[PDB]
Coordinates of C-alpha atoms in Angstrom, one line a residue:
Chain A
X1 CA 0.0 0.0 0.0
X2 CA 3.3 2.2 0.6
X3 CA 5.2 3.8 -2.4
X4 CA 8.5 5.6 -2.2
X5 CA 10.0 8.0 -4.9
X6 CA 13.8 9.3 -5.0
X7 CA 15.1 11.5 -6.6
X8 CA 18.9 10.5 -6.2
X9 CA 21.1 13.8 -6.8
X10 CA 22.2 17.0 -5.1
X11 CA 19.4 18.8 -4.7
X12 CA 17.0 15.8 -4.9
X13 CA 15.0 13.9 -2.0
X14 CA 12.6 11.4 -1.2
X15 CA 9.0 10.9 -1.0
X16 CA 6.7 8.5 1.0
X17 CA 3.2 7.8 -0.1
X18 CA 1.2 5.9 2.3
X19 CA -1.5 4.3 1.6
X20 CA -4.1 6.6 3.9
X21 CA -3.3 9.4 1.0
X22 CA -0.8 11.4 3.3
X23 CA 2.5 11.7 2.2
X24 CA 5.9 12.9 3.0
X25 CA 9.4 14.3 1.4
X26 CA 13.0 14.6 3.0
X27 CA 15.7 16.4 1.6
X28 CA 18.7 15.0 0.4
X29 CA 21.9 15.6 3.1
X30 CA 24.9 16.6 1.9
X31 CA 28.3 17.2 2.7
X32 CA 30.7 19.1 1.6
X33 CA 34.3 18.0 -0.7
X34 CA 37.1 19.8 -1.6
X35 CA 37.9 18.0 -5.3
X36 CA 40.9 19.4 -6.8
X37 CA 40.6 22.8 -5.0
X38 CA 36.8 23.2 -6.3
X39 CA 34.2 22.9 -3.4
X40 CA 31.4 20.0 -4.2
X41 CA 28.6 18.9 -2.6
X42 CA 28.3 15.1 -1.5
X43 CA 25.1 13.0 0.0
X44 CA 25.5 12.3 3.3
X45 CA 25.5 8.3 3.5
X46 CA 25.4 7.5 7.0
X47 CA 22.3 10.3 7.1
X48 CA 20.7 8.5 4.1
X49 CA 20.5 5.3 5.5
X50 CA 19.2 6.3 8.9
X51 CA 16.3 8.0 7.5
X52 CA 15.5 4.9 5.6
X53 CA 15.5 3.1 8.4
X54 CA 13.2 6.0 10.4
X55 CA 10.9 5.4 7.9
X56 CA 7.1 4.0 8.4
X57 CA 6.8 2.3 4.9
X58 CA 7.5 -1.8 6.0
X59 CA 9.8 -4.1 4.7
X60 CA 9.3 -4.8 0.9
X61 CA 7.8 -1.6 -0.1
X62 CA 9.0 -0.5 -4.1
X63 CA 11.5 2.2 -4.0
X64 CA 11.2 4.3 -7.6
X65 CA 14.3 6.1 -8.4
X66 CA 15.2 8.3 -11.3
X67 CA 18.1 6.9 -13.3
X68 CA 19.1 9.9 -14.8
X69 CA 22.3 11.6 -17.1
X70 CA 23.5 14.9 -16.1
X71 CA 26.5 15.8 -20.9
X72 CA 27.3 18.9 -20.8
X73 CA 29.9 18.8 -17.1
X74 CA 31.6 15.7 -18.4
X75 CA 34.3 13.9 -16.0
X76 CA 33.6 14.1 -12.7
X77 CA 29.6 14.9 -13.1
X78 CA 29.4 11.5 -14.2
X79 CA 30.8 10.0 -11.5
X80 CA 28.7 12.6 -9.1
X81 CA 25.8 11.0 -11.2
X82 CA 27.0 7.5 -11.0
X83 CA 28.0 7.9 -7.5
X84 CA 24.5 9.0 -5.7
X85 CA 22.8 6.6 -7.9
X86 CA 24.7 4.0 -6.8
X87 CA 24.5 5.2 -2.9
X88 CA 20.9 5.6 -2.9
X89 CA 20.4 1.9 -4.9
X90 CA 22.6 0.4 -2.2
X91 CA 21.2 2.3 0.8
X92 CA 17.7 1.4 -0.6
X93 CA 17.8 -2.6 -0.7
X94 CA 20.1 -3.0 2.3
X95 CA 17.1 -1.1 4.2
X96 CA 14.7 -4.0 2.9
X97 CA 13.0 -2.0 0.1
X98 CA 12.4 -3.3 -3.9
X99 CA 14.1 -0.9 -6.2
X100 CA 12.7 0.1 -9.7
X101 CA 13.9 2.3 -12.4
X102 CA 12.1 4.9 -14.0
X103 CA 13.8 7.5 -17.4
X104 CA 13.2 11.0 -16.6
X105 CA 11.6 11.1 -20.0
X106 CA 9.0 8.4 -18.4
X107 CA 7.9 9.6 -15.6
X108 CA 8.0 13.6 -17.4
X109 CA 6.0 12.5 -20.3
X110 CA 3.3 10.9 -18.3
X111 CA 3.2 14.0 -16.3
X112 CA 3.0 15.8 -19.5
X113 CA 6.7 17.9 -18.7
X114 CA 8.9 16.5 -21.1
X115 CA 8.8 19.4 -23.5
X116 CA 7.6 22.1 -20.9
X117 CA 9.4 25.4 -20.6
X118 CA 9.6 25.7 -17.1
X119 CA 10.4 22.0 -16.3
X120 CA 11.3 22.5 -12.8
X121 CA 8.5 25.1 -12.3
X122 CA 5.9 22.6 -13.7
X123 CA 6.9 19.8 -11.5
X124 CA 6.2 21.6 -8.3
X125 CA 2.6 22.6 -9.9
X126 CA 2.1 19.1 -10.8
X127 CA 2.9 18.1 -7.6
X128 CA 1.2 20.3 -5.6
X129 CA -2.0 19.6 -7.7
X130 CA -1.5 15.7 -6.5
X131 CA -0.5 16.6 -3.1
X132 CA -1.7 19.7 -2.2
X133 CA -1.2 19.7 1.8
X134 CA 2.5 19.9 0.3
X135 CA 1.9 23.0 -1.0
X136 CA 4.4 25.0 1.5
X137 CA 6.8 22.4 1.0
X138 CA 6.6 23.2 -2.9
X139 CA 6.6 27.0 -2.5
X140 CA 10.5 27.8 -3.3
X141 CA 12.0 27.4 -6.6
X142 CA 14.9 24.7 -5.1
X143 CA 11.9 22.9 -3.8
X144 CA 12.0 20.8 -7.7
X145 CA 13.9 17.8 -6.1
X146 CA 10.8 17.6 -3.7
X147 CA 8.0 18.1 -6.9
X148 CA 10.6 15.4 -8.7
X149 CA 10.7 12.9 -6.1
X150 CA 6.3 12.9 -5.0
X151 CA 6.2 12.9 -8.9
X152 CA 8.4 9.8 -8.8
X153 CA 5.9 8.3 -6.2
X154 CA 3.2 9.2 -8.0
X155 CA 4.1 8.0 -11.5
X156 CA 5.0 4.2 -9.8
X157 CA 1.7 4.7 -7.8
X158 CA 0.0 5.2 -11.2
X159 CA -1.7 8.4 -10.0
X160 CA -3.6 10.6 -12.1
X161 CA -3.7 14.7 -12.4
X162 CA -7.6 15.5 -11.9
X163 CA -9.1 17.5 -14.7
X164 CA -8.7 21.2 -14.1
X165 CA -6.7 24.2 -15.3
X166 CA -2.9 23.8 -15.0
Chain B
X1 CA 40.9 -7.4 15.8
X2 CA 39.6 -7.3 12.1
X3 CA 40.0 -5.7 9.0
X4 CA 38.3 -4.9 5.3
X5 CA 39.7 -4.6 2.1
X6 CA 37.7 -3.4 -1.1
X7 CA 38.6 -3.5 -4.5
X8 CA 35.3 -1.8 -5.4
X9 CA 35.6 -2.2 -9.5
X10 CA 34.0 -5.0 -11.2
X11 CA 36.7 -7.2 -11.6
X12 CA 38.0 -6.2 -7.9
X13 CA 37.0 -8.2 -4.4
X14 CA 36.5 -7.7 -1.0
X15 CA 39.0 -9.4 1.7
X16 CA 38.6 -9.9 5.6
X17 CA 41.6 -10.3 7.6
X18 CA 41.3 -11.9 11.2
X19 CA 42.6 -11.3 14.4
X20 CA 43.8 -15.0 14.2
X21 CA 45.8 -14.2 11.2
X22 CA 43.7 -16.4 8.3
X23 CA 42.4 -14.5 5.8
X24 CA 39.3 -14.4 3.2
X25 CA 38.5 -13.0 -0.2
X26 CA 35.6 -12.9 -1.9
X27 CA 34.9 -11.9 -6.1
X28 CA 32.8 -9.6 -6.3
X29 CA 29.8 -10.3 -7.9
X30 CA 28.2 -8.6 -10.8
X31 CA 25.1 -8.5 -13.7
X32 CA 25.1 -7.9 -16.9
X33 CA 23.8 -4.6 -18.5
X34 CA 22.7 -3.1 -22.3
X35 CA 24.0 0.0 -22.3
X36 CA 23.0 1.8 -25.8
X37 CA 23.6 -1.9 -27.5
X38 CA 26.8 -2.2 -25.6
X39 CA 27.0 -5.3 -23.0
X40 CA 28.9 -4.1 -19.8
X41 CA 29.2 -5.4 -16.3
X42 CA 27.1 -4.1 -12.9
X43 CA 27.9 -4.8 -9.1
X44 CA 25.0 -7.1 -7.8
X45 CA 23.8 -5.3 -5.4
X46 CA 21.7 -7.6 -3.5
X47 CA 24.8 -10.7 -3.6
X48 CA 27.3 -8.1 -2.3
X49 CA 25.1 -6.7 0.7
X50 CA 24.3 -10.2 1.1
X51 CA 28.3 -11.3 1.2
X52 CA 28.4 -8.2 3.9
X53 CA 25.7 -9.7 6.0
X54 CA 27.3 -13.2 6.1
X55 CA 31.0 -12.1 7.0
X56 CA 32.0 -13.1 10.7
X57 CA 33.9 -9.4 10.8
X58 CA 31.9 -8.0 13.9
X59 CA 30.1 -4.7 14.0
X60 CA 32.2 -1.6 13.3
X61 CA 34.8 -2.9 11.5
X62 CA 36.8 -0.6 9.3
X63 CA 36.4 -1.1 5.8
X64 CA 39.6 -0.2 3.5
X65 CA 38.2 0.7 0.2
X66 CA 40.2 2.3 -2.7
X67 CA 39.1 5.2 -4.3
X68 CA 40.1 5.3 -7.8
X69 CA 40.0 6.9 -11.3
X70 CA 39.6 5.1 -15.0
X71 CA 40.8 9.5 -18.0
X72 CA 40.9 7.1 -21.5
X73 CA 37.0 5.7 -21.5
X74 CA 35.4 9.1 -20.3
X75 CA 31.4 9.7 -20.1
X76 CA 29.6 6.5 -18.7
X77 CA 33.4 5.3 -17.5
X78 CA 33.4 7.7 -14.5
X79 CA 29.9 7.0 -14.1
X80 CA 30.9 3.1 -13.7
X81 CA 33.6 3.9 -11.3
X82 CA 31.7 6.5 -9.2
X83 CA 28.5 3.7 -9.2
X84 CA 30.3 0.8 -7.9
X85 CA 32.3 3.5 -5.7
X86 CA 28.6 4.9 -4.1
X87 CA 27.8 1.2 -4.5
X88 CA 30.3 -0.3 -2.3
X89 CA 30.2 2.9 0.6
X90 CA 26.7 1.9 1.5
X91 CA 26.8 -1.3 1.2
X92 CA 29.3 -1.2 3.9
X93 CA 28.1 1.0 6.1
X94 CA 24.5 0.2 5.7
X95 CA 26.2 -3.5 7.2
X96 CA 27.9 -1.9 9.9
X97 CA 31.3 -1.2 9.0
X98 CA 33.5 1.9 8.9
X99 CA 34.9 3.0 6.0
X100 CA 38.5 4.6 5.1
X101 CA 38.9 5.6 1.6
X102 CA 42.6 4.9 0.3
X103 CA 43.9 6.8 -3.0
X104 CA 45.9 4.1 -5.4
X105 CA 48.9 5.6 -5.0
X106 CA 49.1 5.4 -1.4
X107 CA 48.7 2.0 -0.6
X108 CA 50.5 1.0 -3.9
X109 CA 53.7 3.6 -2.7
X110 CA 53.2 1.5 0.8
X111 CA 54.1 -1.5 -1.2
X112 CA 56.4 -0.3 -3.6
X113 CA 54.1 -0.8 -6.8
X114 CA 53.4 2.5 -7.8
X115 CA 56.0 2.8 -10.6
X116 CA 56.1 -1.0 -11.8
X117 CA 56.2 -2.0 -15.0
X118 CA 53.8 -5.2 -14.5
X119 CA 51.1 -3.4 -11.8
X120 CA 48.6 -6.3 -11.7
X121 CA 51.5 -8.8 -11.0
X122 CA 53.7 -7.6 -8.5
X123 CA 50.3 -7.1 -6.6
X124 CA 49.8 -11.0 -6.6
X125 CA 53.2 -11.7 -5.7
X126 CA 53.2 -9.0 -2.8
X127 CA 49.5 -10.3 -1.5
X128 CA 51.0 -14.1 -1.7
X129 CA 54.2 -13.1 0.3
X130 CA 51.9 -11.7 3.1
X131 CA 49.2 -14.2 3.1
X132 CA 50.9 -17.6 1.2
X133 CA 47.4 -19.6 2.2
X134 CA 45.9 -17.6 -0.7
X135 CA 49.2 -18.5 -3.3
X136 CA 45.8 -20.7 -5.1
X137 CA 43.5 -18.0 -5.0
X138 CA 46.3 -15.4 -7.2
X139 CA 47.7 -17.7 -9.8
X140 CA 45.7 -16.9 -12.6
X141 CA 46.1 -12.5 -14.0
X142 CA 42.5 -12.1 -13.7
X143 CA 43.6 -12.3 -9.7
X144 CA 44.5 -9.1 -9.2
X145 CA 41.4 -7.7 -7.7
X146 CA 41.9 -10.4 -5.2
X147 CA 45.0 -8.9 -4.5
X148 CA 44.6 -5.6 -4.5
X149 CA 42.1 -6.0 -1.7
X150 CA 44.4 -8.1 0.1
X151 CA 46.6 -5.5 0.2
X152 CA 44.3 -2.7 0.7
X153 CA 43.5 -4.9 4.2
X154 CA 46.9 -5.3 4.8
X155 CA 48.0 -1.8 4.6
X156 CA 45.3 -0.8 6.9
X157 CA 46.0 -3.0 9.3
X158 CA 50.0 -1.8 9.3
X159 CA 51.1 -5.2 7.5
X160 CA 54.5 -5.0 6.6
X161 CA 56.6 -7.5 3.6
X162 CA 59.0 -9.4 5.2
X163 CA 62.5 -9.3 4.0
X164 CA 63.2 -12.1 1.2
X165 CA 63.1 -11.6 -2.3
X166 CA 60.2 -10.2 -4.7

């Protein structure tokens, strides 16, 4: 009845649905790295796990993750990419959760975003129109790894956008 | 009393040193991929958090991992390498263990490999000098991710070569 999305990078998070219709998000953490003199950001691992295993969705429950490509930063924001991917994949089914999947371009084209303007800006719309008690958690323009990951819940929940003006 | 080593690339191991002096190492274990036609390898997640949960290391553990770089295969290369890097990390501490990140050339300076002319070898015969019950487990070339997280064990734990021949 549970349903968890992740939005794996920097600036992502992840989302809880439960099956009473509430729902939750948590930020990404971070730390920070020095790489050759250039300050980076880097999830926070240990962080990670233990809100995974803080979490009230049981044993079993599917995990859908974005499996994304940064190519216009090249070396290095591959391995970023490759790196939280991996880290959340591993931190995911070590806390007893099924892992699945999902192309931006999926879970964006059933959203109707994959040709959209204002990508980020549509995605906190579109989430706040399936979640709207999430509204002040959407309100900030940085708040697109929240819309991302609900989305990501949503899309391997099989929600739907009710009819109305977008 | 114990110790991890981690050879985190496909084609690299993971090896548990003992306070009673035996020693273990383990392949680690992998998938096969289509990535745009091309077949490549992928960590199993699952069998390697698995091979965590079944080691008799005890809780907090520290895990010796090395921390490399491919720059000749670029985009999807560094994306391997920082995956099965973020891979390994959480697997290990999501199991318990600690984890020290070791650059190549330090624990390849420690042993005197980092300017050899046959890398992957020297690394058997340096792994088989400090641990001779594994002499079976390095005789074939394809060995040296056996070794290299013998040694990367053996250099966290302050191992040192005896003096003989090499």
């Amino acid at each position: 009845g549970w349903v968890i999305g992740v939005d794996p990078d920097i600036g992502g998070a992840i989302a809880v649905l439960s099956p009473d219709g509430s729902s939750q998000v948590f930020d990404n953490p971070f730390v920070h790295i020095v790489v050759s003199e250039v300050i980076r950001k880097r999830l926070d691992t240990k962080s990670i796990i233990e809100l995974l295993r803080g979490l009230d969705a049981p044993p079993g429950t599917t995990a859908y993750i974005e499996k994304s490509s940064p190519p216009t930063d090249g070396k290095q924001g591959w391995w970023s990419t490759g790196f939280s991917y991996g880290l959340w994949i591993a931190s995911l089914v070590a806390s007893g959760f099924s892992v699945v999947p999902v192309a931006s371009q999926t879970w964006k084209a059933y959203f109707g975003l994959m040709r959209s303007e204002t990508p980020k800006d549509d995605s906190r719309q579109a989430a706040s129109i399936l979640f709207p008690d999430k509204d002040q958690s959407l309100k900030l323009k940085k708040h697109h790894g929240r819309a991302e990951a609900l989305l990501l819940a949503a899309y391997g929940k099989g929600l739907v956008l009710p009819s109305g003006k977008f």
